[PDB]
């Protein structure tokens, strides 16, 4: 229904003479690209991370990114005068595009300053965030007047180059991005909820994609006290979820944890509590 490709940058200005530049590329929540600051080159994290692009196209992009990172850093360091009151400060960029199953792609380029929205790119125009006053206004004047060809480069990249790349990247990675991975589950005790009370914990780990259902059970009866935590990341593209239950002293025998997930289909995981209680 909706898939995104994001190129992000983080520019950390420590003082007038020292800054850091970092960046990466993401297919939804999956990191597909890194950036090597030592050598100024793209890091292709998967065998399919080139999508349908040729090496010449990617080399063009690499030179564009190296030049952008260096030149943005130096123009900010110039315009940031002596200050040292503003330092340290941090600039974040989130640019990219979205493919939608029924509609046209979306493209975007958003900038934050010290964690707050600063400005964004709207088709032809750099637009200050209403919430970041003077500074946003000032920067946008310059971006709209002085850097006017960089602007058509940006528009072409986010509106044309990015959705083309994303389509080819989804196609090259199709037998990874549509994978199904089955979780495992295990039970443990948890911290005491109170005197004469126990906490049972059902850990579910290694599933992909993220939608999942977990309930504590007594036979076929779902248990009221079931409480799910957040869906947390594992390395190598799977997820983790904890489901707890508080139970009265003398009542835990016969309880089980039941897991439903797309990768199982009609073979729910059912794990019985066998003690520690």
């Amino acid at each position: 229904e909706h898939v995104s490709f994001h190129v992000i940058q983080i520019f950390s200005f420590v003082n007038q003479s020292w800054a850091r530049g970092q960046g990466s590329g993401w297919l939804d929540e999956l990191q597909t690209h890194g950036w090597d600051s030592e050598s100024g080159t793209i890091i292709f994290l998967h065998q399919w991370s080139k999508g349908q692009f040729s090496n010449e196209e990617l080399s063009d992009l690499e030179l564009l990114f190296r030049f952008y990172l260096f030149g943005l850093t130096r123009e900010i360091q110039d315009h940031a005068s002596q200050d040292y009151s503003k330092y340290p400060f941090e600039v974040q960029v989130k640019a990219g595009c979205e493919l939608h199953s029924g509609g046209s792609p979306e493209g975007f380029f958003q900038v934050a300053f010290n964690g707050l929205d600063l400005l964004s790119f709207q088709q032809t125009t750099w637009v200050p965030s209403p919430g970041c006053g003077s500074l946003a206004q000032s920067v946008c004047h310059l971006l709209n007047h002085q850097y006017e060809g960089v602007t058509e480069t940006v528009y072409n990249l986010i509106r044309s180059t990015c959705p083309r790349f994303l389509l080819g990247l989804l196609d090259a990675g199709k037998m990874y991005v549509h994978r199904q991975v089955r979780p495992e589950a295990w039970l443990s005790s948890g911290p005491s909820p109170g005197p004469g009370r126990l906490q049972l914990v059902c850990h579910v780990s290694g599933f992909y994609p993220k939608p999942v259902w977990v309930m504590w059970m007594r036979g076929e009866q779902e248990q009221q006290g079931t409480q799910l935590g957040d869906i947390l990341p594992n390395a190598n593209g799977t997820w983790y979820l904890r489901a707890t239950l508080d139970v009265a002293d003398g009542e835990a025998a016969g309880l089980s944890c039941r897991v439903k997930h797309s990768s199982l289909e009609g073979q729910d995981i059912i794990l019985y509590w066998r003690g520690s209680l």
Binding site: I10, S12, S24, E90, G115, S188, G206, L232
Partner: protein
């Protein structure tokens, strides 16, 4: 301005079984600015061979990082995730509870 304090969650990839190879994860999220020190610890000492995701951030511009290391638990060993950040007066150490993990909803 503004500054946001990291949230620290510690959990294992597989059931905690002594002598069985496993992965220890530390998910550190919701912080700003990006400058941070995150270390996985074994008996108080930084684990030197770890992996971490590249820096990324959420829709609200707060940063997040996933740390992980291969480890083999035993009954005596204590594992933790330690974080220092400008929002933190003193480094914060989040001990890994083997049974519960150490999460923050």
């Amino acid at each position: 301005a503004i500054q946001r304090t990291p949230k620290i969650q510690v959990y294992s990839r597989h059931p905690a079984e002594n002598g069985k190879s496993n992965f220890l994860n530390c998910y550190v999220s919701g912080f700003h600015p990006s400058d941070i020190e995150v270390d996985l610890l074994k008996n108080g000492e930084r684990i030197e061979k770890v992996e971490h995701s590249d820096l990324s951030f959420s829709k609200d511009w707060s940063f997040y990082l996933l740390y992980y290391t291969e480890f083999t638990p035993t009954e005596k060993d204590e594992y933790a995730c330690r974080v220092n950040h400008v929002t933190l007066s003193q480094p914060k150490i989040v001990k890994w509870d083997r049974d519960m993990g150490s999460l923050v909803p």
